[PDB]
């Protein structure tokens, strides 16, 4: 109720859950994440 | 209820879940993610 | 209820789920993602 | 009720859950996360 | 009730849960997390 | 009631729960966490 | 009632729960945590 | 009622609970925790 | 009623509970904890 | 009523509870704890 | 009523409860505890 | 029931049911009256 | 019930049910009257 | 009930039910009248 | 009931039920009238 | 009941129920009238 | 009841119930009228 | 009841119930009328 | 009752109930009318 | 009752009940009318 | 009753009840009308 | 009653009840009308 981010990760190897949230009445350039070199 | 991002990742190897959320009344250039070099 | 992004990733190798969301009353150039070098 | 981020991680190996939340009436460039070198 | 971040970690090996929360009426560049070298 | 961060860690090996919370009427660059070298 | 951080740690090996909380009317650069070399 | 941090630690081996709390009307750079070399 | 930090530690081996609390009207750089070499 | 820190430690081996509390109208750099070499 | 720190220690082996409290109208660098070499 | 008034998000007033489950690697072996995994 | 008034998020007024479960590796073996995993 | 007035978050007024459970590796063996894992 | 007035967070006025449980490795063996894990 | 007035956090006025339990490795063996783990 | 007026935290006025329990390794063996672990 | 006026913390005016218990390794063996672990 | 006026901490005016118990390794064996561990 | 006026700590005016008990290794064996461990 | 005026600590004016007990290794064996350990 | 005026400590004006007891290894064996350990 709000931003509910769960993770379960059963019998896993290498699991992660990243979350960002930038709330404002005014916000100059809010990033969530930086640059990615390699993905997946 | 809101932004609900779950991950389950069963018997997995290398699982991730990235989320960004930039809410404002005014926001100059909100990125979510940077540049990707390689994907998948 | 809202933006619900789940991932399951069963017996997987290399799974990811990226999400961006830029809500505003006014937003100059909101990107979601940067440049991709290679995809898939 | 609010941002509820749980993790369960059953029989797992290498599980993590990162969360950021930048609330303001005004915020110049709030990041959530820095640059990623490799992902997943 | 507020930001409730629980973790359960049953029979696990290597589990973590990181959370940041930067509330203000005004905040110049609030990060949540620094740069990541490798993820997952 | 407020930010309630519990951890249960049953039969676990290597479990941790990090939490930061920077509340202010005004705060120049409040980080939550520093740079990460390796994650998960 | 306030920030209630409990930990249970049943039959565990290596469990920890870190919490920071920096409340102010004004605070220049309040960190919660320093740099992490390795995580999880 | 206030910040209530309990720990139970049943049949455990290596359990800890760290908490910091820096309240002020004004506080220049209040950290909670220093740098971490290895985590979990 | 105030900051109530209890620990129970039943049948345990190696249990600890650290707490800091720096209240002021003004406080230059109040840390709670120093640097950590290894955690968990 | 105030900061009530109890410990119970039943059938335990190696239990401790550390608490600091630095109240002031003004306090330059009040630490609670020094550097930790190894934790948990 | 005030800071009430009790310990019960039933059938225990190695139990301790450390408490510090530095109240002032003005106090330059009040520590509570020194450096820790190993913890838990 | 009452009205629901959102700009940027779900204004549900009806019987809104979300479910995410995983029944991965799960084996239902009933001789009689078995139901497994009913996510409505 | 009463009205719900959000700008940026779920204004639910109805019977809103969220569920996330995992039934991974779970084995239901009833002879009679077994239900397993009913996430509504 | 009464109205609910949010800018940036869930203004629930209805019967809002959140659940997260894991039934991983869990084995229900009833001869009669067994229900396991009912997350509404 | 009374109204609820938030800017940045859940203004619940209804019957808000949160639950997180884990039933991992848990084995329900009733001959009659067994329910296990009912998280509403 | 009375109104609830928050800027940055949950203004609950309704019947708000939070629960976190773990029923891990727990074995319910009733012959008759057994309920185990009812987290509402 | 009376109003509740917070800037940065939960202004609960309703019947707010928090619970955290662990029923780990716990075995309910009733012949008749057994309930175990009811965390509301 | 009377009003509650906080800046940085829980202004509860309602029936606020917190509970933390552990029922770990605990075995309820009633023949009749047994309830174990009721944390409201 | 009277009003409660805090800046940095819980201003409870209602029926605030905190409980922490442990029922670890505890065995309830009633033939009739047994309740064990009722932490409200 | 009278008002309560704190800057840095709990200004309770209501019926504030704290309890910590341990019922570890404790065995309730009533034939009739036994209650054990009622921590309100 | 009269007002309570603290800067740094609990200004209780209500019925404030603290209790800490341990019922460890304690065995209640009533045939009729036994209550053991009632910590309010 | 009269007012209570503290800077650094509990200004209780209400019915403040503290109790610490231990009922360890204690065995209540009433046939009728036994109460043991009532710490209010």
Numbering used by the authors:
A (entry chain E), B (entry chain C), C (entry chain A), D (entry chain G), E (entry chain I), F (entry chain K), ...: 85 to 124
Structure paper excerpt:
The human nucleoporin Nup98 forms fusion proteins in certain types of malignant leukaemia, is a critical component of the permeability barrier of the nuclear pore complex and is mislocalized in cytosolic deposits in Alzheimer’s disease. Key to these Nup98 activities is its large FG-repeat domain with a high number of FG motifs. The most aggregation-prone segment comprises residues 85–124 (named Nup98FG85). All four fibril types display a parallel in-register β-structure comprising short and kinked β-strands.
To gain insight into the molecular organization of cohesive FG-repeat interactions, Nup98FG85 was allowed to aggregate in pure water. EM revealed the formation of well-defined and mostly separated amyloid fibrils. Using cryo-EM, we determined the structures of four different fibril polymorphs (pm1–pm4). Polymorphs pm2 and pm3, which are almost equally populated, were solved at a resolution of 3.3 and 2.8 Å, respectively, and are formed by two protofilaments. The most common motif shared by the four polymorphs is a 13-residue β-turn/β-arch structure. A leucine-phenylalanine pair (L91-F92) is located at the tip of the β-turn, with both side chains pointing away from the turn. The other LF motifs in the four fibril structures show a very similar structure. In all four Nup98FG85 fibril structures, side chains stacked along the fibril axes build glutamine and asparagine ladders (top). Most of the stabilizing interactions arise where there are clusters of two to four phenylalanine rings and one or more leucine side chains. We obtained values of approximately −20 kcal mol–1 per chain for the four Nup98FG85 fibril structures.
